Structure formats: C-alpha cells, structure tokens
Amino acid sequence: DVAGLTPCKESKGFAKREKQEIKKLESRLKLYAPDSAPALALNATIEKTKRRFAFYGNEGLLCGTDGLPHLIVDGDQAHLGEFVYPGLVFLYIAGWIGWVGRAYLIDVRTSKKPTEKEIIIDVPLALRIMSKGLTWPVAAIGELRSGKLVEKSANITVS
C-alpha cells in the first residue's frame, strides 16, 4: 500500500525467504538421527522459524521488492505498532530512570558528605525513590508548573 510496499502475507518473495531457510535447516538436520540432541535442537529452530514467519504476516507489516519487512515510522494509524506504541513505553521507562536519578541526587545533595553517598549508595533511600518514581509525568509537570524544576543562578563564567 503506502510507499509502494505490499503486505507481507501476500508477498511472493517472503515465501522464498521462508522456504530457502527451511530447506537449509533440513539439509543441516539430515546429518544426524531423529533421536539425538542436534536433531532436537534443529527441529526446535525450524519450529521457531515457522512461528516467526507466521506472525509478521498476521501483524500487518509491509514487505519490500526483496521480501523483507519495512517499518513505516510515519504516524500511520494502521502501523502504530511499529514506532509510536513501543516508543511511548520506552519514553515512559527512560523518564522513570531519569526522574528517579534526579530525585536521588536532589535528596543526597543535602547531607553531610554528599560525595560519599555517590560512590556508596544508601539502598533504603534509593529504593524508596525508585518506588515513588512510577508516576513521574504527574510529578515532572507538577514541578514545572510550580517553578521548582530549573535554577536561575547558574555558575557559568567567561572572561
């Protein structure tokens, strides 16, 4: 459809990309007995290959003129499962990491030896902050609105 790519469950080049690999695996397989560890491993590999090729066609990815999936990172509603759906969860996880790290730094900074608490972590406080870091957007936006997110008296100097 879009970008001149056909869906993968109709691509006549995907069939070859499957059957050639299957036949290679079977050529490897025919060097043992059907009741030996190499044969079991190879049959498992073949079943995994079939299960993989019978999922891309059902998902809705568009293959190319060479029989290979192509990702439409465009915003297309028929393809949200390629970029934006995993991208949102990644952004969630990364904001989580950053927010809990920032909060740990903020809390440690007001102590006796803050430099000591950075080579020797204090696991109770760090764990508390990691736990509380689940609702980080509702906290980051709240700190932005309340004017608590940024400083103004930065210590940069240039003569």
Partner 1 sequence: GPKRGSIVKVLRRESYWFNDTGKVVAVDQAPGVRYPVVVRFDKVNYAGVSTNNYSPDELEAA
Partner 2 sequence: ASRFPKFSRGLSQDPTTRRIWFGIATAHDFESHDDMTEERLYQKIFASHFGQLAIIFLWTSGNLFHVAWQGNFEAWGQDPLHVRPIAHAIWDPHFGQPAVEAFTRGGASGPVNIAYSGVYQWWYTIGLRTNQDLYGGSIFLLFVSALFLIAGWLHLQPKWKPSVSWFKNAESRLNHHLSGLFGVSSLAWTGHLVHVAIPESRGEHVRWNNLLTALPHPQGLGPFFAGQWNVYAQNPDSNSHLFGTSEGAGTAILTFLGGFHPQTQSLWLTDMAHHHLAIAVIFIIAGHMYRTNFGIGHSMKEILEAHTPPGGRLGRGHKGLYDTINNSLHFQLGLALASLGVITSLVAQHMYSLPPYAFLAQDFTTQAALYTHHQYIAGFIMTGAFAHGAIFFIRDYNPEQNKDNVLARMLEHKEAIISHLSWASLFLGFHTLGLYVHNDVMLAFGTPEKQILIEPVFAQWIQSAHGKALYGFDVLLSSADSPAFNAGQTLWLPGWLDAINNNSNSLFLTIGPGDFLVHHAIALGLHTTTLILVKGALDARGSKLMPDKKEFGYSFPCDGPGRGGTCDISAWDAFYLAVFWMLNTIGWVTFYWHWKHITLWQGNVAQFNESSTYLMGWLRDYLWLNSSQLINGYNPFGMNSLSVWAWMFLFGHLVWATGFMFLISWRGYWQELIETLAWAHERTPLANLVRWKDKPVALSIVQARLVGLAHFSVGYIFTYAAFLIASTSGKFG
Residues contributing to the annotated binding site for chlorophyll a? 74, 77, 96
Is residue 70 part of the contact set for partner 2 (CB under 8 A)? Answer: yes
Q: Cβ(125)–Cβ(104) under 8 Å? A: yes
Bridge partner residues of 22 (DSSP)? none
Q: Whats the size of the chain, residue-wise?
A: 159
**From partner 1, partner 2, none, interface partner of 130 (C-beta below 5 to 8 A by class):** none
Decide which of partner 2, partner 1, none touches 153; Cβ closer than 5 to 8 Å per partner kind.
partner 1
Round to whole Å and give the CA distance between 87 and 79.
13
Per partner kind, with CB cut-offs from 5 to 8 A, the member of partner 2, partner 1, none near residue 120 is none
Cβ neighbours for 96, distance < 8 A, ≥ 6 positions apart: 133, 134, 136
Distance CA 113, CA 116 (A): 5
Q: How far is the CB of 109 from partner 1 (least distance, A)?
A: 11
Smallest distance, Å, CB 111 to partner 2?
Answer: 26
Under the binding rule (CB under 8 A), the answer on residue 150 touching partner 1 is no
Q: Which stretch binds partner 2 (CB under 8 A): 36-44, 52-60, 90-98, 127-135?
A: 52-60
Please give the helix or strand (H or E) that residue 63 lies within, else none: strand 62-63
Q: Does 119 bind partner 1 (CB under 8 A)?
A: no
Q: Which does 53 bind (CB under 5 to 8 A by kind): partner 2, partner 1, none?
A: partner 2
Structure tokens at 34: 């059907």
- The pair phi, psi for residue 146, each rounded to 5°, is -85, 5
**Which stretches of the chain bind partner 2, using CB under 8 A?**
2-5, 14, 17, 21, 24, 52-53, 56, 64-74, 156-159
